[PDB]
Curated annotation (Swiss-Prot):
GO terms for cellular component: outer membrane-bounded periplasmic space. The gene is pliG. Its main location: periplasm. It comes from Escherichia coli (strain K12). One of its GO terms (biological process) is defense response. Inhibits activity of g-type lysozyme, which confers increased lysozyme tolerance to the bacterium. Keywords: Periplasm, Signal. It comes from the Bacteria. The keyword Transmembrane does not apply. This is Inhibitor of g-type lysozyme. One of its GO terms (molecular function) is lysozyme inhibitor activity. It is found in: Periplasm.
Length: 111
């Protein structure tokens, strides 16, 4: 299926970049540990690839994509709890069902 990757930042830096490609129902998971109140910002090159956040203090998931109402004016989301979070990159059920593919570059920033 999709891949599961542990997010690692270069020491002293606050973002990492990854590339992937999801097909059909495959979704990629970028896992990270962070502290309550730290802010996450995710940008992705392909808007056909949804970007949802799962983790502690989150009911279901939070839409982190650029037009999501969950973000502030800086495109950031404040983590509600400390612990292990998952950023999932996936397609819509429609595109999944139609066996489409999404090639993407994702940037994950945590401050």
């Amino acid at each position: 299926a999709g891949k599961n990757v542990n997010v690692e930042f270069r020491k002293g830096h606050s973002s990492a970049q990854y590339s992937g490609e999801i097909k059909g129902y495959d979704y990629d998971t970028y896992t990270f540990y962070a502290k309550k109140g730290q802010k996450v910002h995710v940008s992705i090159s392909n808007e056909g690839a949804d970007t949802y956040l799962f983790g502690p203090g989150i009911d279901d998931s939070v839409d982190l994509s650029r037009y999501s109402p969950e973000l502030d004016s800086h495109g950031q989301y404040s983590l509600p709890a400390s612990g292990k979070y998952e950023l999932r990159v996936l397609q819509t059920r429609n595109d999944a069902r139609k066996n489409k593919t999404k090639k993407y570059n994702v940037d994950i920033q945590i401050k």
